[PDB]
A paper describes a structure:
The structure of the apo form was solved by performing multi-wavelength anomalous diffraction experiments, collecting data at three distinct wavelengths. The structure solution unveils the presence of two independent polypeptide chains in the asymmetric unit of the ApoTmArgBP crystals. An analysis of the intermolecular contacts established by ApoTmArgBP molecules within the crystals, carried out by using the server PISA, clearly indicates that the these two independent molecules constitute a stable dimer. Indeed, the total buried area in the complex is 1387 Å2. Similar to other arginine-binding proteins, ApoTmArgBP is folded into two distinct lobes, each consisting of a β-sheet core formed by five strands, surrounded by helices. β-sheets of lobes I (residues 23–110 and residues 210–231) and II (residues 116–203) present topologies β2β1β3β5β4 and β8β7β9β6β10, respectively. In line with unliganded SBPs, the two lobes of the proteins are far away from each other and do not establish significant non-covalent interactions. Indeed, the two subunits in the dimer mutually exchange their C-terminal helix (residues 237–246). An important role in the swapping process is played by the hinge region 232-KKSPY-236 whose extended conformation hampers the association of the terminal helix with its own subunit and favors its anchoring the main body of the other polypeptide chain. Using the program DynDom, we computed a difference in the closure angle between lobe I and lobe II of 20° for the apo form, whereas no difference was detected for the holo form. Indeed, the C-terminal helix of Apo-TmArgBP forms interactions with residues at the closed interface between the two lobes of the adjacent monomer, an interface which is not accessible in the Holo form, since locked by the arginine ligand.
Numbering used by the authors:
A (entry chain A): 1 to 226
B (entry chain B): 1 to 227
Write the structure that this text describes.
């Protein structure tokens, strides 16, 4: 696959641009997002242009098998059923919701059932909003911005926040007064998919993911512990 | 504290240079190593020279408390007892063991108990040797060099290797046929110590550590999941 991509001069990436912030159409009409940036990095490393081929999500695996695309990068969860059909890269994104509480409390909810009888702050319209709104005995307070749901928690006016894992860990890393009490709920891991026989491109992609995840701290460890 | 450091023109870092590869004395009498490289980074970013004050490990906290040094960077484990006396930075080093296995396998041990009934390669007399040798049902295969323990694993002659997280990570980075299957098996971490009153210097040190730990992936997360 790699020689054919390099000869053609562009990488064909299938996605369905109706999944912000992974892939979506911005105010300028461009397809952008977290997954699009990984696709752009892979194409740059291969020395080729990126050609996005947008289609419905259910079209992506058939397109890959028909060779109309080289790779799928589209918020695609690695599952056993998909593994029978396509090869995935190492997981590149851990999806799901978590429950955040004050570190100095005793309260350690593990599930939405543990939040019955409590006040929970969520960001309007998000998965956490939709989930907690199923539970009539949760007192739900809704915020335009997730930062203000955390501020409500910090002030003791909510008992917990529910938010996606990536965003919540990023925030809690900056706010040592909060802690993630649950595991990741409805967890999924996303993978980059490529035809089973195209193991050259698969291992190239696993190499780019490794690189993206290496920090100067990792390089320092390599310097002194090799 | 920062104004005073900059006025003086040098950062005083205390350490005990008897702990390779964290801090030790090289062939030419220079004090070098992982911790020294962190100290040099911090001094560079403050715009000052680094002045290492070498002393015995038990002398470090008293030297800090009597203001003979600005900071300790010396393989110092964060403990509740020391937290009563000094302020620590974010943890900057996980000292515990990890378990390494072949990637093309379903075997993903998480604990020493998961290695029971398996064959584990180790470097002779290291922590990993000492720790696994406690478990009766583990067949232990011992080598003078950790590289040969990994070779035993790669060759299919052992099911896993146990090694400190840092050396395992450095090796696995160049050997994608292997994976670190466990978290760190114990929770000891090193921290950079400063005086509790020196909160500007502590915040500056944390900002250096945080930036060192940021990968391009972390920056991409920040790009797409911020507000």
């Amino acid at each position: 696959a790699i020689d054919e991509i390099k000869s053609r001069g562009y990488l064909l990436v299938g996605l369905s641009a109706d999944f912000p912030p992974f892939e979506f159409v911005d105010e300028n009409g461009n397809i952008v997002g977290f997954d699009v940036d990984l696709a752009k990095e892979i194409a740059r490393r291969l020395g080729v242009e990126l050609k996005i081929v947008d289609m419905t999500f259910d079209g992506l695996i058939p397109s890959l098998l028909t060779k109309k695309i080289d790779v799928i990068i589209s918020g695609m969860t690695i599952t056993e059923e998909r593994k029978k059909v396509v090869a995935f890269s190492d997981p590149y994104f851990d999806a799901g919701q978590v429950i955040v509480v004050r570190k100095d409390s005793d309260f350690r909810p593990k599930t939405y059932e543990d939040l019955v009888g409590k006040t929970v702050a969520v960001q309007i319209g998000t998965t956490g909003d939709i989930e907690v709104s199923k539970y009539d005995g949760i007192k739900v307070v809704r915020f335009d911005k997730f930062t203000d749901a955390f501020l409500e928690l910090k002030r003791g006016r909510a008992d917990a926040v529910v938010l996606d894992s990536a965003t919540a860990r990023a925030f809690v890393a900056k706010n040592p007064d909060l802690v993630i009490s649950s595991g990741v709920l409805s967890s999924e891991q996303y993978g980059i998919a490529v035809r089973k026989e195209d193991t050259d491109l698969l291992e190239f992609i696993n190499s780019v993911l490794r690189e993206l995840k290496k920090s100067p701290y990792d390089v320092l460890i390599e310097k002194w512990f090799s």
